[PDB]
Amino acid sequence: GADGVGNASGNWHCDSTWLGDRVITTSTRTWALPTYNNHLYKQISSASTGASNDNHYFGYSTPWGYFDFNRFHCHFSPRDWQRLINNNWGFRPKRLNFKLFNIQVKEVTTNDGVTTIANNLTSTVQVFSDSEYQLPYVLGSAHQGCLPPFPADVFMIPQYGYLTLNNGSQAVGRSSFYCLEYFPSQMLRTGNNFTFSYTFEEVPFHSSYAHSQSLDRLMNPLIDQYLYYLNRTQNQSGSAQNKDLLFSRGSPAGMSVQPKNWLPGPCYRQQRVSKTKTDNNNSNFTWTGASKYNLNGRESIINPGTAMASHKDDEDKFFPMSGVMIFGKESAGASNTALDNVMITDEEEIKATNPVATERFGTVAVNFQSSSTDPATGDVHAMGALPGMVWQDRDVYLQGPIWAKIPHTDGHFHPSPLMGGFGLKNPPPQILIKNTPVPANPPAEFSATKFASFITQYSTGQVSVEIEWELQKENSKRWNPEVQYTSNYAKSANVDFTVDNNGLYTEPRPIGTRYLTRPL
Amino acid sequence: GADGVGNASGNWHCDSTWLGDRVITTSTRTWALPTYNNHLYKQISSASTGASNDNHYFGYSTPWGYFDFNRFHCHFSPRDWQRLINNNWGFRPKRLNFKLFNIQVKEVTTNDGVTTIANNLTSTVQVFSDSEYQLPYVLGSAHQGCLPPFPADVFMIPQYGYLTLNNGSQAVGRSSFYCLEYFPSQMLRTGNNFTFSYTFEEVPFHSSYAHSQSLDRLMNPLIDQYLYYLNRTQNQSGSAQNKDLLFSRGSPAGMSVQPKNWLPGPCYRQQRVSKTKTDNNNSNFTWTGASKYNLNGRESIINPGTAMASHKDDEDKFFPMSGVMIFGKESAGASNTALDNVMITDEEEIKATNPVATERFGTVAVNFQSSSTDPATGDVHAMGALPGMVWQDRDVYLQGPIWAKIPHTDGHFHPSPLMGGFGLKNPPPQILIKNTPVPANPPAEFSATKFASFITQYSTGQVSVEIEWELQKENSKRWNPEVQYTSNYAKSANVDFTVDNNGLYTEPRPIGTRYLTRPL
Amino acid sequence: GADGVGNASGNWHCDSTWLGDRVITTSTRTWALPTYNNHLYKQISSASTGASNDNHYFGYSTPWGYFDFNRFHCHFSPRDWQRLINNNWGFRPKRLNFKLFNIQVKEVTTNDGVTTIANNLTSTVQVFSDSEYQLPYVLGSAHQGCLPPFPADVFMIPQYGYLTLNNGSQAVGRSSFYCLEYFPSQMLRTGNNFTFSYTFEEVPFHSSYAHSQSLDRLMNPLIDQYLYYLNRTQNQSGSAQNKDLLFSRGSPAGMSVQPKNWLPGPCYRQQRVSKTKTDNNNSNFTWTGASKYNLNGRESIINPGTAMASHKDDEDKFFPMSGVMIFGKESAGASNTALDNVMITDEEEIKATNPVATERFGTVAVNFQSSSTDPATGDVHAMGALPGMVWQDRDVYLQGPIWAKIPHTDGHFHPSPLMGGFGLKNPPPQILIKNTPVPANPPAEFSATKFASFITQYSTGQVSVEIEWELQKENSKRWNPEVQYTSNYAKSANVDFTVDNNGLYTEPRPIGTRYLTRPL
Numbered sequence A, B, C: 001g002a003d004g005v006g007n008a009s010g011n012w013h014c015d016s017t018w019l020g021d022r023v024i025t026t027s028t029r030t031w032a033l034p035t036y037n038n039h040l041y042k043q044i045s046s047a048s049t050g051a052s053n054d055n056h057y058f059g060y061s062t063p064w065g066y067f068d069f070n071r072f073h074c075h076f077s078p079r080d081w082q083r084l085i086n087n088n089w090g091f092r093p094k095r096l097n098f099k100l101f102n103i104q105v106k107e108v109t110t111n112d113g114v115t116t117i118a119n120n121l122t123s124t125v126q127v128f129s130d131s132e133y134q135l136p137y138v139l140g141s142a143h144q145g146c147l148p149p150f151p152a153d154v155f156m157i158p159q160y161g162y163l164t165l166n167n168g169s170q171a172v173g174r175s176s177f178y179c180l181e182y183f184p185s186q187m188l189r190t191g192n193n194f195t196f197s198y199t200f201e202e203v204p205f206h207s208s209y210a211h212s213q214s215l216d217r218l219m220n221p222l223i224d225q226y227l228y229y230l231n232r233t234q235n236q237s238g239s240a241q242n243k244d245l246l247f248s249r250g251s252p253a254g255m256s257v258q259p260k261n262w263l264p265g266p267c268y269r270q271q272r273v274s275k276t277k278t279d280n281n282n283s284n285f286t287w288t289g290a291s292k293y294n295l296n297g298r299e300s301i302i303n304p305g306t307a308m309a310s311h312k313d314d315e316d317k318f319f320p321m322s323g324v325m326i327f328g329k330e331s332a333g334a335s336n337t338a339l340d341n342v343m344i345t346d347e348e349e350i351k352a353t354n355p356v357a358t359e360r361f362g363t364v365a366v367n368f369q370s371s372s373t374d375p376a377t378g379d380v381h382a383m384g385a386l387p388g389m390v391w392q393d394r395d396v397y398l399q400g401p402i403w404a405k406i407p408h409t410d411g412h413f414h415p416s417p418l419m420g421g422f423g424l425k426n427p428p429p430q431i432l433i434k435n436t437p438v439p440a441n442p443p444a445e446f447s448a449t450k451f452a453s454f455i456t457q458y459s460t461g462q463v464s465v466e467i468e469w470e471l472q473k474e475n476s477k478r479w480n481p482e483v484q485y486t487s488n489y490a491k492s493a494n495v496d497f498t499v500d501n502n503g504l505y506t507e508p509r510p511i512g513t514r515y516l517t518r519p520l
């Protein structure tokens, strides 16, 4: 778009419109973009430092930044989240509309103690979207820098970096270097705007419900089965302990031995740790007792891992060591902050279909019983996909990620992104933004040496994102009332999800989606 | 339909019509429906009793009953089963036609010792099908109450109950209560009839064949491979035991080491127990040595579990403890009945593609061999899905289930119902039937207290089910004759699959489907 | 409708369909009708007994009964109630569809100890609706006999009676006697059915919301007013107490004296009584301390009276003596049952606009202050309509009444029915049902004396009621989550709103409608 300097290039579109089976959200925020890296790319490495082989990395930092609207509180206000989670069985993304407008480039001059900031009306910010996914996709790794939950909050734009292959601190012949100046990008003075629109692929609805039934309780409790199972191997009503083979048919007085059609979901057990520090071991096991994976002689913790229940009935005090998502409160520090500065999610409502993360999967025969060799079973702590298995994927949270790019691989098994959300062959693309460098005054004699002297400058503008979501309506024939999410009627000093007296918005708990119920 | 009291509302459609690649079966049976629960719902619980945490349950019994035609002998006569299993490579359901007709409600009065049963011409039985699957699906759990194998046999209609979430004997906020009076239902006096028709989704043909080849015998026995494998690590023809690295190419004289393209199916080993009581351990291991799964701190035996072969070549005497389906003979009791009162199925013909259930899957390296550290392998007793795996699902039996509803989950791996059959997103729906309550004479003064005084009454009628099945024809270029199912030419006191002198039909053995063969 | 004896005359239409801004409920129940009064009308009186002049009455009992579907649990299942109360700002009735079908008349014969009940196929039940409101309207007085909450529950039909003018036990010339045989009525044998349809007049939406603001907190807290008020009458900063006239302008530091635009609602104070028996007076004041009205020298308690708040902030333990609706639990007796056998409603959420019922309205000058005569104020305990007043009508409850007929008077002020609901000029009409008398065998000689000898007989049938309700959608721009109604996630022995193990449905608490909020 073309406009004079004194002429808005867009309006503040933020709203929340529901119609039928669709909810269209639009959120507008204002962003600050600084010069990053001094308009330079810089090779970045784990060289020096001596970080453990696990942490060794090689890659690049970029002069560009990016936009990230991959969190639900980017487009769903908490009261809108409630409308979703309280009345819908599912939902998914469908289309997306993005706009960059009202961009103002400013020049900064520092003389002595005093700094002056003036408008540079001829400078340009450049935006481009990686629609062919040619750049390393850095979204979908739960990074900060996303659009803020509170529309009145101004955010800084995160800087783009990526990585490639690394052996230790060194690189390899295949490792890749990307110059974002190589792509075509739209240049904008304060009069220009920028827009694009995107359609999501077909993906399934997310499960904004819990099961009112469990896998081991699907049968009719009033009706014996016609199937029989081997019941005893030692005779009932015998004076000694004499060998026998006694068969019984399925009965309600024994749901635990009735033949069944299905298996619980896959499991990959994690250590159980109590929220009350006393019960725990007096050691520092978050690594040595970690459930981890082993890629290229390099260990990386599994978190959040295969979707499993967080604790059993009545054991609310526990949690898997790396098998739940944990959001920090606004006060929490960056490292080694106390329990009550963070919020731990509880995926307990899937215990209906999925193993508890802290427990075994089951028991397995491991020998051939005979009159001589006593039978033997062992426990299963890793259980891969078996035919018959049914499972519920890990739930999403107002604060949590929305989607992820499915890695481009020959093969993938059930590629829901492990942290929750939609796994996309072709996600929404990255939007890269950079301030055009503005050289200061060159010398009066020619010098072919790289230009290192630039007007210090930063830019600010608004950003608009419209997303149409589909809803899956609830058709439940349940008589009794369902569980619903609700603010606490009682009194307190602070409304939930609000600014305080200093003006700080705070999200008090994580809100997931599984409240309505349906049969299994 | 509308008809006078003296006017049949349907005819006895039972038959067996084959045309081309299709077989249409129709079976009509007559049913008795009683008043269940005294027209009340009743909360049902494991409260009291003290059943082990495994067996704890919470749910409801319903005044309604249901129809169940989810067994093959409901629609296939044994001689028709033979035509299927002896000449077809596969088959599947396609459509379904159901009819309720000739319904007669009767009133019962008991005075002293003598009981009188008269016709109540104004009373109504109500039927409705759960076409939106809004009710907990209780079919597909191998319950009794199905249509009888012998058309001349009159059956009682099973009562509907369901279950929801349970912690111990207590319930949880999400648990669900269903009133079947909440759905619209068709009311019928003796003149009315009821019909509906259903189409199955596309599902694959069932495998009414065995493999004439095994996974490890697919290569050409006359032709060396061009691939090489590491053959020796200790020198042949050396005076000492000197280290070496000797490579050999694939050869018929060693099929066991030839590189191959595929893996057997997944395994989840079960205990092996002999049909001859002597060889077995002198203990009662059907639980302690059980292979089980662990859901919500509650153990449930796996039966019948992942589809595996029942015994190896020449070991006919064994069987997996909970890895075969077992049908009771008509004489067998409900609990702790002898070996010869039941019939144990033998899925041995899949040993071609699938692990034997009682044995390991394979062997795995578990260390790094060096001149110092001796190499080490361990056994695999649980093997999840690996790329390359091929497998044959558990076979179906004249007496066995036909289909099951695939649980409504975010995820499922190869959802064939474990007991055999077709896993259906939208199966045939439940048909719920109930007798309308008939109040006896109220008092002459008003009383808003619930009415507890009703004419005792039961109903009887016929029921018709027409199913069109598709057949997959056998195209085999096998020269020699195939194995076929056959009654025994020789003499005996009883024809197979018949009434005896008291009039009792008996099914003498389980009949599966895998008789024809095709290459792997 | 015309149908043979063996031919249903209607189907079981019960359901719950939401579309757009409309919710259509349909509920079907089955009813027993007895012979009432022995087909006689009987004058009924307070004669004898000696009931206090307050309780004296004169009227009639009728051989007919009536239908009553004037409670919400007649057409709203609790989970449907939740959908209403959790997502709508309002709702109202629109149309109505009623049907009588499947009617079965039965004859009863008692010989010795044994009773026999047979079908009488030629007997007729007669129904008619009082569409011209010619009969005393007995609905809308909170009587029992309504359709039961649980569709599977069979109910007895209440008997019709009415009343007219009474002086003591005696009657007056104007008192009115009604013969329901005087109206035309539809006669039905077991083959006939009966239907009618009704449209509600336009009435306002009910307020299924609470105010997020109060009348005294509508101003901007950051901005002084331009209005001034007389602040002091005794000089600040004077050594003595010298008379002055000091004026101050409206300020946030004094919301209590700022000029305002509105008045709270009307009040008619009631006695405050604590739910904890200790704090209360040691006397029996429910009459002597009752707030009552005085009509024709006859006292009648006001209950529930003008709509007022039930307790103030933090005084949850109190309630107005006759100014709240109280539902009995199923266990409660008819008279003098304990506190925990009943459920007391809490209309506290209207304290935003309306006086607290237990407190004064305000204070009023009652003299002329001078330097000699000290100023004086008194309290207001009855406050009639004043210009400026705004108020919220008493809320409705799942168990509570739906509508009432507005009395046919020259005058009415804001005629919302005091117990909650819709006040209707022309409500849904009464449906009167009676069994036609069946004379037994007359003598063989003529006798003109009234026939007193009839076959004892009662009737049963189903009844269908379809109501279309309009919804007022919630458009709230509230950021934080609203309060919502919810079943308790935690464990317990009983699901809410269910049958127990004996089969008894129980409604555990009263559920009102005010959960969403809007500004005042």
Ligand SMILES: CC(=O)N[C@H]1[C@H]([C@H](O)[C@H](O)CO)O[C@@](O)(C(=O)O)C[C@@H]1O
Binding pocket: A231, A232, A253, A254, A255, A256, A257, B052, B054, B055, B284, B285, B286, B287
């Ligand atoms: C319902 C149930 O769990 N049954 C199990 C029983 C019970 O422990 C006893 O019947 C206790 O009364 O023990 C077995 O060893 C048996 O005796 O057959 C295995 C079987 O699985």
Ligand SMILES: CC(=O)N[C@H]1[C@H]([C@H](O)[C@H](O)CO)O[C@@](O)(C(=O)O)C[C@@H]1O
Binding pocket: B231, B232, B253, B254, B255, B256, B257
């Ligand atoms: C066909 C076959 O199984 N070959 C195996 C042989 C045989 O046991 C010997 O050749 C016995 O003659 O043993 C090996 O250790 C070897 O010597 O290479 C491994 C190899 O897999």
Ligand SMILES: CC(=O)N[C@H]1[C@H]([C@H](O)[C@H](O)CO)O[C@@](O)(C(=O)O)C[C@@H]1O
Binding pocket: C231, C232, C253, C254, C255, C256, C257
């Ligand atoms: C905000 C408020 O309630 N102001 C009131 C004050 C306060 O009680 C004193 O200012 C206490 O500091 O008392 C008055 O008599 C006055 O002095 O004018 C009346 C006035 O309504």
Ligand SMILES: [Mg+2]
Binding pocket: A015, A016, A017
């Ligand atoms: Mg709008």
Ligand SMILES: [Mg+2]
Binding pocket: B015, B016, B017
């Ligand atoms: Mg034929």
Ligand SMILES: [Mg+2]
Binding pocket: C015, C016, C017
């Ligand atoms: Mg519907």
